């Protein structure tokens, strides 16, 4: 199989750059349209991260920063599969996450929210998907938190995630939420996404059969990246 | 067929969650940074720096930047590279950084990339792919950094020539400077307004 | 107005004593039917609790036990009204609550759940409704937690509440949950309640307009107790 | 018209959340307990104690018990009491307690209640209303405690006589005992099985 | 009751500043997002207008400007209640109105519309709501009128109204229309409002039972202003 | 819970219907105006004037302006003021005006407000709340007027500091001038474009 | 992959022990609730049965007991797949079946039903699923038969089946029926199962494309056993 | 995710269809039975026998019983056993039997199991997992057989201690007896009523 | 796996031999019923075509006949999978196609249609499916064309295809159409097929994500052939 270029990103399945509902976007969105280009090796290539560099607890946010004891909060496991738009599993892709603690507080002097800090929680993790595009990490369920869009704006609970896979064109950063969270319906950031079906694509589903008794709950969340088309005739990529 | 997972802003803490070490969060033993140069890396070292300004002309101090480039011979340290040429074994080609919370300047210590093949037997001028993430940015903004001392090559570059507004092509060309003995390329990114940097949908 | 007896408790709006789905009930439920009695002064009377005894922070679970700092977790305010079945407000009724912390852990050596303990959280509060039957307390949103009914049983997040009002016949203890919590649909305890409408009567609703910016979220939850009928003819209560 | 809020079990920690002091949770300065006797309270002091057994004959160590009673003259310290008589000013009439985590015994220090008016000009024998809460109990179980030394009055008691199974009436009569100088009434509650205690829907 | 701040204005229930359909808004709308601020005494306070200053006919647009005779047009009474978003009546709030006459002509040399002027009609009135937030004024039903948005643009019949209540944050100016007016469906100004339910919130309803025989018709129109939340814990307003 | 009545533009005649007297419509005996100074009012009199420009730089001649401020001691003539201090009995604190149909200038004769308490024990620099109504403006635009001779106080003002773009804070500071003996504060409002005035959602 | 414990058996997808409709269950059902335990090696292990022990006709009920000729009745083939609840095939699991003959008569002196015995039919078979969890056996379609629950009770046609797979926790015995059999709707035993969807899970479907011309009909029937969860963090099984 | 195939009673002929040989149905050459002891099997041979009684105290003569156990060293002849220890090569660990149509007694000839590891580094007392199938039993009933001569170990057994009703733990302990030279463990199963055997949901 | 015979062809999923709507069929359809036979090696066997014989451009109808330049018309890629009725991929099956050019004109002196001939287009191609039953060829979208059934009869655009796979019983020739073509609804030939679902089974679907930018569009079209049943008991095929 000789691979061609990645399928075109469907701009309609993504939030526009200018979304007045999300205020900060008003001054950080280009006024000019994005210039689409035909892909070259620069776009279809991406870096490789060796597993040797990853620590044993990089994907365990419950323990990778616990000092005296355990972080306070809901013990949850999150797993899922990373596939490309054509169903192919994405192997050895770097998945990085960051989140707030159970109070909705981020570990940084910038975050002045009254929600309490947890001395045993960092809020950062990372992993490499396996040969089946499978990923799994453990953490504390992040709490929602206020922010100033409109003075009383509140982000539903969420975990920020980033992916670097096989092609630079696949580079993606997003946020996933937890099923049932009522703040999901009122979030200006989540509402920057045009379709209802795409909004729901960011909701991790409770995976009850995979709860670990007397220990942790589990959420299932799958991620889909852009995929490459195969070439059977002219190969103009080069 | 499935739809791509919808993008969302990196948020106000993206430059913290993806660079924990620099936010005093020592969770990882091996941390990713903005230094793509290893002792045995080939090519001439260069420093790429600049600022990102919003629609008011103010530098963003919460931006996260990543770059992707080829080695000194124009080969990508990627299995997807089909040039049949060997790549510099001591080069990751990727780097990540944020801006100084005060000054607002971001930078990378890397090598000047060699020319990479373009589509249909063409040749691309040396460039570095760069992406911008930050609060208020719903989808990572893609752009390219070309070098002004490569005027001859940039003139024949396919991507630069695909931009019909010749006047905007220059927003993608960084300026060479020499601080003592080090070569520095200044590249300022303007997200909105006059001389707005060209952004690509790759 | 000369008050008569309390209206009959509608057994169909309550869980039966024997509910095999909730295992512990199998041995702690009478096999004989409850003997209904006509009410006397013993049933229509109840104790009075003077406000003088209540401390300033009895209804603030965030601060009534904070020692070094604040408890870890989601800052939430819960308020609502207590009325009798005929809409009349219940004045000066003692409302007592108890809950787990953000980890789903209760402050007691008995609870051996791995969920972490919070040194700054007690989990107990109490208040007296005002002349409008209104009540309000602040706390940390309790986290769900495992228990052994079936090894992998999990209680949705909840706050236990108790009420002592005007009549002993009104004595009631129950639990309320939070809107959107997916564990609500699988709970054997909540499912001991026959009707779907009564199950929903125990769900606190997100009260977004009453969220306090950059501080706390709010939930609205109303409680209904049995009411007394008025007597206009024979008064056989005595 | 609204429906009553549905009952739910007090759960495994009901005897802890409603008696924080005794669980070493010092949040309240003034705590509610099982002592209804104040120095100026009138009437003869008595101790009410017993155990609650499940269907296997095992005592529950996680039960929460509360009692409601009238003063020594049969008047309730409640605004709902319409007897027109003054109530003992030093009597709450209510008390709450749990069982010892080991022995399983529960108890209250109170006064023996005076006769209270029944319906239609009748007179009720002295009694104490008691309610049981605990894990596995979906709705608080109501019952009454009568005294065996009040045989004459119990015989004419309306509630006791409303129980058509005369053999079950005795499950509501506590036994008087005298430990040295103190009067104690033993009252064991059997939730299920033989000699199952009578429970009311009041 | 110690009052806190006013609940956040729900930007989605109001027209955006930029509405290209209404041309004049293109150059009179900020390009920057509104900066939301936490409220202070400046925002929760407002002026008081003593009833002594109001004339006996200030709320009677039929007579407050009649010179030789009565104004020509449909005699209508308009009343309703002003409440805050939580149902509380707004007491002694200044309600000011202005409108065109029966021809759709405003009393001003600027208005050059061929619709005839009425020498006995002014088109201005004002009142203070009572303790129940009730208000009532009499007037002539204004006629629709042309304006230049698109050359053949026509405003449905309307009465402009303004309110100054208890808090500066409640300051509001709007327009209400009359039930059944077909121009309502085509108005670019009314269509600047996003939801259909909010558009209908500006339609005065025919109140037939309150028509005064052989005299005047009546319309019922209620107004809702933002409300204050009560504070039961920290009071940071000051 | 009910939703707020939706806003609508004041329309082309808002500055006429709310200021009938000045449009030669004598319906009211007592008319509201732009003069907040009464003979016994305390504080130093000042004149607040300026213009409102659209996105083209043209002054609006159909704008209606209102201001809300505290007295000379920073107390609002409002029952909602909880300072426990007495307010100037001869001060309404509110005023309304339009722009001259020709020149386009608007103005108010008032007093310079005293400092008002901010949230959490803070102190706000002297300011006047102002709102703009007019044709093309769908919702009244809220803004504040601070004074340039109060540099020290403005620097510590909570609201001004909540504006992260320090460069826009100045659009809220009026300039002091002295015409003979009268103190005048020039305050121009720019709704759109460069140096666009900051608008609040209060 | 390090395997953990089997997912909890969902008691709601199975008949309760006490089902008064099925009379014999009244005295053979525990009155106490089942005690759920956390799993150990005892529960996750199970015996292995070597294929060497199985005869060539063990899965052919038409011939494994034919003496003089062939059994009388409908020639049918039954096949399907055995998977765990997560879709994984169950390999080398022992599947044992037993049934009545075409008359509804079982080969045993206990069965005194007038339905005629077949000298060439045994009614017992067994097999091991392959690497794909596939199984296949041939038999005579069993006839329905009367039994005494209520004097005129009739079991729809059925084949009893048993499975011993990878874990003792998977041990399962049940019965499957044939699509279209009208007795299915009236069976007290089948009705001990709570949900309609689970009842249908026991119905073998006519697989027409797999009928063998001029020979035998075919039914498709899949079986689902409990599955094990994988462990990626603590492995407390040991 | 799929749901587990719903259980159904084994029916009145389960002890016949799963033990054809003993019902005079010779279809299989190799038949499964209740003899887990092979000539080279290690460990001390023991006989496990008893009866199963219904709610009336009557022995079931149509019950099918199976047992699962580890070898003499506490290792299961199963690929799922992760002890890293070798298992007795001459031991199936599983057996099946029915009750005598007359007497009602069932039995197995096996070996006494060695201790097996429990969860979290604990150690389980020697036990045999047993399951009951029969007419009237909708779902196979799981239970365990412990040995009375292992008092010390049973006391520390995790599963036995998970049973909060200490009085029911004994229903899982079989009694050792010695008929001449053979060791026999009597284990009677009571499905309903007094001394009802504990059943597990594994 | 020992294979048996192919499943019976379902005559109802195919057009009958006699279809008066398609005139030419009136004289070229047997009046006798087809005689069904049990299969033998003759029916389950088929020829093998080595890939060595196929030229590099046999599956590229755009270039395999281009002389001076490129053929005129719509550049389209057509791909899909060939499976048997049981989902198994058909490997190395010979797929041959033939079609008209962009004018609806076939390259042959017989076709006298005024639609213009294309000197650079042949209209013939062939390929072998891979191990996944996948096939792909490139061509010019054929134009519809008139024919004489009823004087004004028009065939929707179509490509004729033929398949020789593993068994002679699978021999099949048909035609596929393009999604959206309105002539599809009026074609007498396509309407010889009884069911609507089978008619739709011949429509190639626009595969937008697989369009090649600035080059060619793509259509997805899957083909299903009859499948063989496996034999687990008697094997009478021989
Ligand atoms: Fe965040
Ligand atoms: Fe609880
Ligand atoms: Fe108007
Ligand atoms: Fe049967």
């Amino acid at each position: 199989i000789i691979w061609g270029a990645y399928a075109q990103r469907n701009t309609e399945d993504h939030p526009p750059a200018y979304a007045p509902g999300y205020k900060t976007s008003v001054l950080r969105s280009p006024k000019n349209a994005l210039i689409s280009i035909a892909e070259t090796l620069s776009e279809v290539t991406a870096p490789h991260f060796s597993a040797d560099k990853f620590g044993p607890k990089d994907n365990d946010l419950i323990l990778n920063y616990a000092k005296d004891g355990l972080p306070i909060g809901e013990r949850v496991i999150v797993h899922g599969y990373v596939r490309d738009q054509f169903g192919r599993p994405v192997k050895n892709a770097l998945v990085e996450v960051w989140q707030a603690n159970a109070s909705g507080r981020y570990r940084h002097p910038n975050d002045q929210y009254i929600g309490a800090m947890d001395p045993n929680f960092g809020g950062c993790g990372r992993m490499l998907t396996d040969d089946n595009g499978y990923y799994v990490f453990r953490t504390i369920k992040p709490g929602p938190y206020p922010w100033r869009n409109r003075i009383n704006e509140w982000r539903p609970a969420h975990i920020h995630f980033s992916l670097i896979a096989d092609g630079w064109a696949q580079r993606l950063i997003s946020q996933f939420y937890f099923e049932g969270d009522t703040l999901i319906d009122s979030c200006p950031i989540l509402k920057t996404i045009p379709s209802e079906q795409q909004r729901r694509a960011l909701i991790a589903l409770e995976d009850k059969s995979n709860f670990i008794e007397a220990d942790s709950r589990c959420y299932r969340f799958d991620i889909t990246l852009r995929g490459r088309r195969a070439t059977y005739f002219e190969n103009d990529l080069t | 067929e499935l739809k791509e997972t919808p993008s969302q802003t990196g948020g106000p803490y993206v430059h913290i969650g993806l660079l924990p070490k620099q936010a005093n969060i020592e969770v990882f033993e091996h941390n990713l940074d903005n230094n793509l140069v290893q002792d045995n890396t080939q090519g001439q070292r260069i420093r790429l720096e600049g600022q990102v300004f919003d629609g008011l002309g103010l530098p963003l101090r919460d931006v996260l930047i990543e770059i992707w480039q080829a080695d000194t011979n124009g080969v990508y340290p990627s299995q997807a590279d089909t040039q049949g040429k060997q790549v510099d074994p001591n080069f990751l080609g990727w780097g990540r950084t944020g801006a100084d919370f005060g000054t607002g300047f971001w930078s990378f210590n890397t090598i000047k990339p060699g020319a990479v093949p373009g589509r249909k037997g063409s040749t691309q001028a040396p460039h570095i792919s760069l992406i911008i993430f930050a609060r208020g940015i719903n989808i990572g903004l893609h752009t390219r950094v070309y070098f002004d001392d490569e005027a001859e090559a940039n003139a024949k570059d396919p991507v630069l020539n695909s931009i019909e507004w010749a006047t905007r092509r220059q927003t993608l060309v960084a300026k060479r400077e020499e601080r003592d003995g080090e070569v520095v390329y200044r590249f300022d990114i303007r997200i909105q307004g006059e001389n707005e940097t060209v952004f690509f949908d790759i």
Side-chain angles (χ1 to χ4, degrees), chain A residues 71-74 103 113 116-117 144 146 151-152 180 182 206 211 213-215:
Chain A
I72 302 302
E74 296 169 46
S103 304
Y113 175 50
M117 275 282 299
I151 35 67
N152 215 331
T182 55
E206 171 184 283
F211 279 20
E213 58 294 328
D215 181 356

Side-chain angles (χ1 to χ4, degrees), chain A residues 9-124:
Chain A
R9 162 166 285 170
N10 187 172
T11 59
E12 306 177 68
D13 298 319
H14 289 282
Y18 179 70
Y22 172 35
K23 300 183 183 182
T24 306
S25 78
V26 180
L27 293 172
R28 302 187 177 193
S29 58
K31 64 81 65 182
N32 288 297
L34 296 176
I35 297 181
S36 295
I37 61 173
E39 289 184 348
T40 70
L41 287 183
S42 298
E43 296 65 52
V44 300
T45 56
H48 294 292
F49 301 84
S50 61
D52 292 302
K53 300 178 180 179
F54 294 99
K57 291 185 296 187
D58 293 4
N59 73 319
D60 182 358
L61 291 67
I62 292 186
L63 297 176
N64 67 26
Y65 205 72
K67 311 301 178 181
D68 306 300
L70 297 179
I72 302 302
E74 296 169 46
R75 296 170 62 81
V76 300
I77 296 179
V78 177
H79 60 165
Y81 298 77
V82 182
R83 317 178 206 287
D84 65 14
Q85 44 180 153
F86 304 110
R88 317 194 194 84
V90 180
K91 306 173 183 178
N92 297 301
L94 174 57
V95 179
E96 294 170 290
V97 302
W98 69 97
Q99 63 176 78
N101 65 186
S103 304
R105 185 69 177 292
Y106 281 96
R107 176 175 285 296
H108 191 65
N110 257 200
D111 190 355
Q112 293 292 293
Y113 175 50
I114 185 178
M117 275 282 299
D118 193 321
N120 296 122
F121 186 83
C124 296

Side-chain angles (χ1 to χ4, degrees), chain B residues 28-46:
Chain B
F28 304 149
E29 188 173 2
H30 301 296
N31 298 286
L32 312 177
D33 58 50
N34 68 319
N35 185 184
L36 294 63
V37 180
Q38 300 177 61
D39 40 298
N40 289 59
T41 303
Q42 304 181 62
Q44 57 165 172
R45 290 96 178 81
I46 64 175

Side-chain angles (χ1 to χ4, degrees), chain A residues 45-229:
Chain A
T45 56
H48 294 292
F49 301 84
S50 61
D52 292 302
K53 300 178 180 179
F54 294 99
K57 291 185 296 187
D58 293 4
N59 73 319
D60 182 358
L61 291 67
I62 292 186
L63 297 176
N64 67 26
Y65 205 72
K67 311 301 178 181
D68 306 300
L70 297 179
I72 302 302
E74 296 169 46
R75 296 170 62 81
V76 300
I77 296 179
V78 177
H79 60 165
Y81 298 77
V82 182
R83 317 178 206 287
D84 65 14
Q85 44 180 153
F86 304 110
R88 317 194 194 84
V90 180
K91 306 173 183 178
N92 297 301
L94 174 57
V95 179
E96 294 170 290
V97 302
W98 69 97
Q99 63 176 78
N101 65 186
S103 304
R105 185 69 177 292
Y106 281 96
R107 176 175 285 296
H108 191 65
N110 257 200
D111 190 355
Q112 293 292 293
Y113 175 50
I114 185 178
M117 275 282 299
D118 193 321
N120 296 122
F121 186 83
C124 296
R126 61 185 183 186
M127 336 109 208
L128 293 177
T129 59
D130 58 36
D131 299 309
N132 301 305
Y134 186 68
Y135 78 85
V136 60
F137 65 105
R138 182 169 67 176
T139 183
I140 291 301
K141 183 171 183 174
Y145 60 76
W147 61 298
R148 191 176 62 164
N149 188 56
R150 288 174 295 185
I151 35 67
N152 215 331
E153 210 78 73
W154 291 71
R155 295 308 316 296
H158 61 285
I159 290 178
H160 297 276
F161 69 85
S162 172
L163 282 84
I164 302 178
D166 299 86
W168 197 233
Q170 288 173 142
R171 191 72 184 76
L172 175 71
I173 282 188
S174 191
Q175 296 174 45
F176 75 73
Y177 313 80
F178 303 79
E179 170 177 34
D181 187 339
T182 55
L183 289 173
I184 288 182
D185 297 299
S186 299
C187 184
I189 291 183
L190 180 61
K191 288 191 293 64
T192 59
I193 297 177
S195 72
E196 179 65 4
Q197 55 173 174
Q198 278 298 73
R199 296 176 187 179
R200 289 176 297 189
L202 298 181
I203 300 174
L205 301 305
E206 171 184 283
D207 192 358
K208 196 174 176 63
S209 291
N210 284 299
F211 279 20
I212 300 185
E213 58 294 328
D215 181 356
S216 307
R217 287 187 299 159
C218 182
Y219 284 85
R220 171 60 181 288
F221 179 63
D222 290 350
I223 299 173
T224 303
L225 302 180
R226 295 168 60 191
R228 299 184 70 173
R229 299 165 295 182

Side-chain angles (χ1 to χ4, degrees), chain B residues 109-120:
Chain B
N109 293 300
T110 184
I111 255 58
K112 184 177 179 179
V116 179
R119 299 172 64 71
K120 300 178 178 180

